Amino acid sequence: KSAPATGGVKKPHRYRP
Amino acid sequence: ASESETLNPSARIMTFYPTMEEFRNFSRYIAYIESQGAHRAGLAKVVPPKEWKPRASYDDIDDLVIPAPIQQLVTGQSGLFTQYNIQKKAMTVREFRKIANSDKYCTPRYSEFEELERKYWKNLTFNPPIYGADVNGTLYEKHVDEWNIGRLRTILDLVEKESGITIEGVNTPYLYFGMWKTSFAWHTEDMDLYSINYLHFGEPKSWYSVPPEHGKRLERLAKGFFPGSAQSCEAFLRHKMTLISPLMLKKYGIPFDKVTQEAGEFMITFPYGYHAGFNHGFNCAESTNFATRRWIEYGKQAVLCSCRKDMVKISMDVFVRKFQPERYKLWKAGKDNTVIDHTLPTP
Ligand SMILES: O=C(O)CNC(=O)C(=O)O
Ligand SMILES: [Fe+2]
């Protein structure tokens, strides 16, 4: 693995200026 | 066709007007609209009984803080665009509403929606609006027990129940403050779950939807238009950056339907139902995901984005074990080759 099988956020990508 | 494919054969967006009695049980009503074939369109509208309300008034939120508003820069032409969301500094609803109503970002004048729609697709790459999207929180009052986006009580609760894991926006509520031309790109829900959207107040929100039965066709078209993105991540549409106009879908034979959501109305998206849209002007919506027994197969076969590390991922193990015990062993051994029937409800 390398990440959880359950988790995350719904808020998509967020680029900054 | 076994009455399953006989229901809503055109797979169009249906609208329902439940009585307070039918409205009382959420999961039951969902199963009810699916019995009428509502899931075929991938999107359905539900108008709550007139005497129902989740909050008394919204004259006390000018203070609410939008921690990470985003400015939507869109690049593209000929009905194909990519949206880059730039994070702006936190701001209150008051400040947002101010800008939203300014003549700079104000809603243009128009006669019929058709015209407003043409203006949207004509100027979406100009004067980049700000969207106060994905804000943790609810506007429902503690006592509202009917269709409370904060606690729908579906089997999706098993995730939190079994592991205590919280996934903001998925098993928790999100609020979206929009202005004219703010939009949401083409996508299905994370893990191809269902979503519920309630427009608390403000201008309308228009939606486009592709029947789950034709979702793979939309993907093939998308892959072809954005080959680069497709090869770096099969499920690149989950990045929620791809915009495709209805004329383009029309030009390539991809079936779809459109609907406009008005304040006080609910929108329900079904598993593997691709949707996109834009806001007419200043408005506020609340939404979250939910699950049904029918979603389980979808969740097991959902194609996920891996090129990013922070994407929503849900272990299906607890669901297969509890609702598909006879297939757990087989599934765990990657030998579960079940085929999904998008028209079939839940016998
Ligand atoms: O509100 C938005 O901008 C997008 N909403 C959804 O995709 C939804 O409710 O399923
Ligand atoms: Fe969605």
Ligand SMILES: [Zn+2]
């Ligand atoms: Zn990806």
